Amino acid sequence: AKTYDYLFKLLLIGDSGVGKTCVLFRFSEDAFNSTFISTIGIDFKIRTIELDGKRIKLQIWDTAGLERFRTITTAYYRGAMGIMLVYDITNEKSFDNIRNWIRNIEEHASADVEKMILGNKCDVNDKRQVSKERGEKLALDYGIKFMETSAKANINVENAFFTLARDIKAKMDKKHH
Amino acid sequence: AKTYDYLFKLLLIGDSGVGKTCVLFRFSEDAFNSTFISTIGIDFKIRTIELDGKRIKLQIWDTAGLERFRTITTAYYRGAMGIMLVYDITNEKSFDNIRNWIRNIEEHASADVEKMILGNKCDVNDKRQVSKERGEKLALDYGIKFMETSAKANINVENAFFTLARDIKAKMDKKHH
Amino acid sequence: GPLQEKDQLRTQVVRLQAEKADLLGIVSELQLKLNS
Amino acid sequence: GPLQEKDQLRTQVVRLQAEKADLLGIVSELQLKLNS
Ligand SMILES: Nc1nc2c(ncn2[C@@H]2O[C@H](COP(=O)(O)OP(=O)(O)OP(=O)(O)O)[C@@H](O)[C@H]2O)c(=O)[nH]1
Ligand SMILES: Nc1nc2c(ncn2[C@@H]2O[C@H](COP(=O)(O)OP(=O)(O)OP(=O)(O)O)[C@@H](O)[C@H]2O)c(=O)[nH]1
Ligand SMILES: [Mg+2]
Ligand SMILES: [Mg+2]
Numbered sequence A, B: 001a002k003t004y005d006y007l008f009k010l011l012l013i014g015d016s017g018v019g020k021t022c023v024l025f026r027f028s029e030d031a032f033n034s035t036f037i038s039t040i041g042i043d044f045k046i047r048t049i050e051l052d053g054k055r056i057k058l059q060i061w062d063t064a065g066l067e068r069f070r071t072i073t074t075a076y077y078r079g080a081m082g083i084m085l086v087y088d089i090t091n092e093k094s095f096d097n098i099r100n101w102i103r104n105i106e107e108h109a110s111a112d113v114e115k116m117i118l119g120n121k122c123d124v125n126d127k128r129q130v131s132k133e134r135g136e137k138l139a140l141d142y143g144i145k146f147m148e149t150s151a152k153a154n155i156n157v158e159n160a161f162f163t164l165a166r167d168i169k170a171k172m173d174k175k176h177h
Numbered sequence C, D: 001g002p003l004q005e006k007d008q009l010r011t012q013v014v015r016l017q018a019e020k021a022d023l024l025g026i027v028s029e030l031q032l033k034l035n036s
Helices: A020-029 A067-074 A092-096 A098-108 A132-142 A157-176 B020-029 B067-074 B092-096 B098-108 B132-142 B157-176 C002-035 D002-035
Strands: A006-013 A042-051 A054-063 A082-088 A114-120 A145-148 B006-013 B042-051 B054-063 B082-088 B114-120 B145-148
Touching (some): A020 A042, A020 A054, A042 C002, A082 A092, B042 B157, B042 D002, B082 B092, C002 D002
Parallel strands (some): A006 A054, A006 A082, B006 B082
């Protein structure tokens, strides 16, 4: 039997080291690993959730953040229906670069792709370099939803993916009617 | 570190039910399963062997035999460097169709692809419908190597893949010199 | 625990088998878009 | 046996992880041949 009613392709982008893989690892398998293993180009996970009584299969593509992998990762933008833009609240440079990642989306993804900004590692309060207020303001400047997350402490990871998936489904359902 | 010195793409083709998946399952994991699970389009296994002191990575594509999957499986012929043509010694129809599978190779694969015919299920002596002599003669008519195999009893499975890989390597080494 | 290790490895295999199935379908489709 | 079941599941995971790695590379390459 076919195990889903909707299939949404999701992408995680952002600088190397911000926690894209750890965020996905928490979402897809409810686990966290402190040992950094930088992603070689691309990684892939599946999770099927329920929304409005419907089975939503999420095919989630975890891109590498390093510029050396630009050619490979850029080719995954085309089909994406939702994109998480991830920075590290302890790394102001990763936050500054969110504007450049948005431009990368606008050059290579669909014009109407759903977007969300995640300020990750919010459990590391003692090393925060970007206030939550600044993250909210950047998101507001772009009209993009925003959430701070912790893969390690499991904060807002579920909320982030469920919210992005709900926004894709809402758009798709409006296109049907 | 890079774990191989050569990389050979292999394909298994032949009628549904002849034992392509079981032959590969024996080669790649040294196991046999009697319960038929027909392949949905394509399956994929890796095994790295040694030849001439060199590490030979075999990327092996196990095609579905049913005609409904023709469109999908035909697209895998292009890159193949070696192809196993498999029939069932207890099924004369699967043997008759080897000529049509050869034509399929010649229409869609490289002209110089390495080829080998396997008469599988040779352990089922009591139900043989195709003599070994007839299998040898068909292969001889086409200038293609031939072996009878048993995935179940582990007969000539190693020999088949090692021989096909040796023929690819010999050709490639001659192209270098 | 070894049974908790066993169940976690069993669940891993299922998930990897599911990802492999999807990737194989993706490969087959991309190859068909290319042969166009 | 449960440890023989454990080692066989551990070896399965390794093999599936290796196949996934290769398929992901194959997907990335096919997508690049398509964007041409
Ligand atoms: N304390 C804390 N550490 C985290 C969190 N998320 C990720 N990390 C750590 O940050 C490091 C980088 O995490 P990854 O998920 O591998 O980073 P990435 O964005 O996938 O990096 P690339 O694959 O190179 O693009 C890892 O060592 C994690 O342990 C978090 O929420 N809290
Ligand atoms: N006795 C015996 N049975 C075999 C042998 N090889 C395969 N079989 C049986 O034949 C049936 C078909 O085997 P498969 O490998 O699944 O057939 P296939 O060629 O992959 O078929 P498709 O995937 O539909 O193309 C299975 O039930 C196996 O148990 C063999 O060497 N000896
Ligand atoms: Mg990563
Ligand atoms: Mg099969």
